[PDB]
Design a protein around this ligand. Sequence first.
Ligand SMILES: *[C@@H]1O[C@H](CO)[C@@H](O)[C@H](O)[C@H]1NC(C)=O
Ligand SMILES: *[C@@H]1O[C@H](CO)[C@@H](O)[C@H](O)[C@H]1NC(C)=O
Lengths: 701, 701
Amino acid sequence: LVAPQNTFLENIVRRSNDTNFVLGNAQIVDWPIVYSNDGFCKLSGYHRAEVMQKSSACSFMYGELTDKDTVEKVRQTFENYEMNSFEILMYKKNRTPVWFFVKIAPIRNEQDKVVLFLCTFSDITAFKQPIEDDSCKGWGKFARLTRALTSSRGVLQQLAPSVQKGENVHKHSRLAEVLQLGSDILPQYKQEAPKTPPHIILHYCVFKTTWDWIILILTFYTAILVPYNVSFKTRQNNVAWLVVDSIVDVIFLVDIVLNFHTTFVGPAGEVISDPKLIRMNYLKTWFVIDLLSCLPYDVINAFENVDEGISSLFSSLKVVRLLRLGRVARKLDHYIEYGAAVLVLLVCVFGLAAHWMACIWYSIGDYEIFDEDTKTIRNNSWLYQLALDIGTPYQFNKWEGGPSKNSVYISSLYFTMTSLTSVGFGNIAPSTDIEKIFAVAIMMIGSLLYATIFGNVTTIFQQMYANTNRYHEMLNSVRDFLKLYQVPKGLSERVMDYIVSTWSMSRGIDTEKVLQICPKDMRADICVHLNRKVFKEHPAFRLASDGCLRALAMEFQTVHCAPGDLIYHAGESVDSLCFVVSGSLEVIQDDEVVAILGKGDVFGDVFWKEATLAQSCANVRALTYCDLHVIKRDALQKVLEFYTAFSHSFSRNLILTYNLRKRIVFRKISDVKREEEERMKRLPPDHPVRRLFQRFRQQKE
Amino acid sequence: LVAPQNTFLENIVRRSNDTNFVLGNAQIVDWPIVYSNDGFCKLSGYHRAEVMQKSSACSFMYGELTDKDTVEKVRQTFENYEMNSFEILMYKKNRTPVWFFVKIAPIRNEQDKVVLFLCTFSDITAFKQPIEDDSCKGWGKFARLTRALTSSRGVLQQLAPSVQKGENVHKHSRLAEVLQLGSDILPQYKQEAPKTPPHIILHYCVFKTTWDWIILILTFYTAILVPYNVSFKTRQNNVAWLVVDSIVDVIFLVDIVLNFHTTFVGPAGEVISDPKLIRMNYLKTWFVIDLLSCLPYDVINAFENVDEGISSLFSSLKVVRLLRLGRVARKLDHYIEYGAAVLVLLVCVFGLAAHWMACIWYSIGDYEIFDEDTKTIRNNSWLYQLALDIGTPYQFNKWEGGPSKNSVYISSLYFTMTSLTSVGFGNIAPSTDIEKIFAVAIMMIGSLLYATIFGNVTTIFQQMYANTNRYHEMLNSVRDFLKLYQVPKGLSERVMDYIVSTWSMSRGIDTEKVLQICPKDMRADICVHLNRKVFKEHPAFRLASDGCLRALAMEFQTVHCAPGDLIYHAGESVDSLCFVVSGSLEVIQDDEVVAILGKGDVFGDVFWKEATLAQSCANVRALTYCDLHVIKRDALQKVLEFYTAFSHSFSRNLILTYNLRKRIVFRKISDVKREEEERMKRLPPDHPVRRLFQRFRQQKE
Ligand SMILES: *[C@@H]1O[C@H](CO)[C@@H](O)[C@H](O)[C@H]1NC(C)=O
Ligand SMILES: *[C@@H]1O[C@H](CO)[C@@H](O)[C@H](O)[C@H]1NC(C)=O
């Protein structure tokens, strides 16, 4: 957990050394106080609420005995933006005069300009001189003064009360804390990176990551080669290999040193910046093992030119270099979260395992064929069999070797692989006592390893199919439902198409869920972004405030209607106006097209004015794949109520492209023609209908 | 994403060339305007709202200087349905006279009839002649005219302001855009298919799919055979094989060409219709590799009759034909969504892998046995062993061959299969250096492949058992619960039966969930379909409107009651009337059957009239598997309130088959008999009861 943050207060607190201060805005008129620490409150005798919004020069704290010249000077300093210190008399809430050592400082910004102020205080009551308006005695006054001035005289100037002339050194020294602050009060209130000391590298750096990678590679190499060295016995013919080993050792040593320096992450503490502490932690955790791993033994052997027994035995100690793979637990934790890399890791392990077991097998073979001092080749073991098979058996004249050093290793590896992978060819196969046991052991291990690999693979398969399989299942269910309730061929098909289409468009993402997952402000922002086509285009929302916009966005849905898929049907409740950001719709009343609705159009019903739910007078079908942005009336109404000044503006602006409330008066042409035709062709039953007519007339008014 | 859509506006916009227009309904009287683009609005000086519903001839735009004859002509044209162009003077909102080149056009339909109108406009102010009612000067007027007529004179007629006599060519040319429109304004407002140009085939066609399938097959064939050719060396004995290869190459070439033409789907753009663009895209993506794959090398070799070195080397280049399987990534994306086909694909891959590795093995064998120039058969390799085994070893007189060309391949394949499948018989088995390494490699590959297959199988198994296993678990849980709370033997059993029965009926489908998954209108339609047995049968809903019906459907539940499973119990709240679409129920009051309720019956309580929740006066049991359609009173009430005219009708129509509110007055026959019997057998304590009687009497009034 790391990010750019403006840790301003914290730094000041750290520097403090148990001192008090206040903060004020520079660019605002009268220098208004915006913050005060608890110490200051304790001192002055005011709460944080009543202190804020007052002038930073402290107009409320002045009185009769306060010097005007000093105040003027302070004002001048404020105007000019300058670091200064002043001794000045001021009153408290309870009206007791106190001398304050006011150390002013202007704070710069990340844009190099002055923005905030700082002003630290300190009591110079007992130090400067005694004055009192009303008191029980002089002694009492003195006592009171002493009580007041505890922070300076108590903890910082605690070697001073024995030695005389504190004004020469002690007060000045105390002021030196403030002076230090002057540097510690230049963090500039800037959203900066986490401050780490020099001679230390970060936990999450690029360089560090590269180094880690390199170390991993080295460890892998060591794992590969050390066992080979142990078993097949190259016997350091070439010095190049030795040199390489030495280099590796050196690198390991360097890495150890780096580790001591570098930063760490705890469960509570996300970043640790203390070097000594980190060193201690390292020592506690993993130092000893690491150090044991990385001693350059070859180098040590080379120089002294001493005992043979001492040397050979020492060489044997190289077995411990296998423990170097302890570094791998850093990325194990760093890369276990991923699914796919785990498989790779497993594969690598398998390879390594095969190598190791091959080496062991070779060693066993070596042990077996010259076990007895009588020098019996024993017609058995795997190695002998191999020799017999590939040509070049064993003979004497001494003991002449059979198979080549390179081939043998390969053979061993093959055997190991067979054992592991459950193939089991059996060209090379276990015959002897120890050998058979070893084989059994490897099989036991091997099966488990294989099983684990399989499991991992299965899990991987599951965790990519899960997103689509669920969808498939859903689709199947829908189909079954349709089959069951015997839905007509067309409607069902349409539904299916819609379902498919949504999946194609979204790629399996619930928008609401995503929104929920995001926090409040972020969610609002996202919503705003989504409805940018609404707010930027239409004239209604250009005047709208930011808060208002945010509010609107939360309530705005969005609908992707298909071609020939009607939104509002004649009779249905008009409960939401709908903006058309794209596509094209048609409005059909009495099976006749009354209105086309294209890009940047609106329809629904004016709710805020009429204040009643109305029937939809006409059908509204969509022509193309039309994107609509709709909002439920109630929510909209609420929003309008909240933002009263905006409501009027909205009313003025938002002209609906077509109201679904209003009827349209019209006749069809065919009907008219028919009427005309009839015209050329052509009292007692008027009384039953006359009454009706009268009633109608009455209703009309 | 493709569907039949009436992209009417878009086509017009495309044709436009920065021009304005309005749309009006032909069949409606007075030719009402239903749409106007932004350009038109800008020109005339009106919003879209006030323009709509006016006459398309523009009665509001006329004035004093407007010619009546022209208007009459326009009217005549409208009446007759005819394409014409007219120059006519009209006013704007601000009352400035303007000459408009009004290009009228009637729009046909998919049913061949005329339905909509079009009428494009263009400013002929500066072009025709100058007239003004009020003006500052002539120059000013001219300037204004110029300002007005920018679309024609600015962009279309931009080579015209140098050359004289613009009325001869320029105006006419401008009108030619309109003329073009006349063709581009014959899309007919028909829900048509997506318009694609000729010489291009669709992405999702039947023919295209077939072609793709064929290509896949060809690729498979190539994968099978090319390696065989490389390894076993038929040496083109027959020309038939060569011919086949040539044919394949030709087909591939054809496919490439087809690909250049054919359509494409992007992430944003669902269909691409531009040919050049598609070609470019193809070039960017996959052209080069494909072209490299498909050169007919054999053909090239055949004709020239040139160098042997040149030929043989060239032949070697056929290795690249393995890369032809790049076509497979089209169906990989198309068929990864399915679970079952993936298994098949994997199997195919496995087969192919086995083939390939067999070929490699054979090659290795070939390399090995005559490695040295001394011609040493070396008593080893797999091939030699095989020869020794099946009869016919090697000999000389030259070098006579041992095993047959057909058998060997088969043997190799078998070996490969053994390696892969983890069987490992070991008739054929790795003995030599390179060979052993190869074997190891194959084992490493093979195990992984096998594991993947296993994983896939497991996933498949999971994704069909998941629907039923959950159900089983649920059942188990229910059983456990019953066991725990010690529910009586009968009730528990009944519950279990019900649970089973529901599962049997539904086949594991939550109806509500399905409904939710569907969108609004679709959902409503589905609901309506479901309650077709209600609405079509009963006389209540025949008069009901469509919107009303829709509203009702949303609120209508449906219940599948078992035999002997009572719905309403005496005392329970009657909060929902219930229609019986099927089955048969009995109503039991005081342990006596008062009413049978069969098909097309109703019961519950009249809510809308009485307006109070009442106790159920009697039990209501079901006889058979009865299907009920019920609706909660509150929802129904709301619906009724919404549709006021319908409510009265509903009240008039809906006669409940039996009210659960009302008591029935009756005596049992046995009781009567008893009373009668008693009759033949047979004042001071009247005063305690007299008071009670009096009270009762009082209550009565
Ligand atoms: C090993 O077997 C060989 C024959 O293959 C034989 O001559 C020999 O005596 C055997 N070795 C021993 C120690 O018995
Ligand atoms: C191969 O083995 C045979 C006996 O099976 C033998 O006669 C021959 O000499 C061996 N070949 C070589 C090159 O040693």
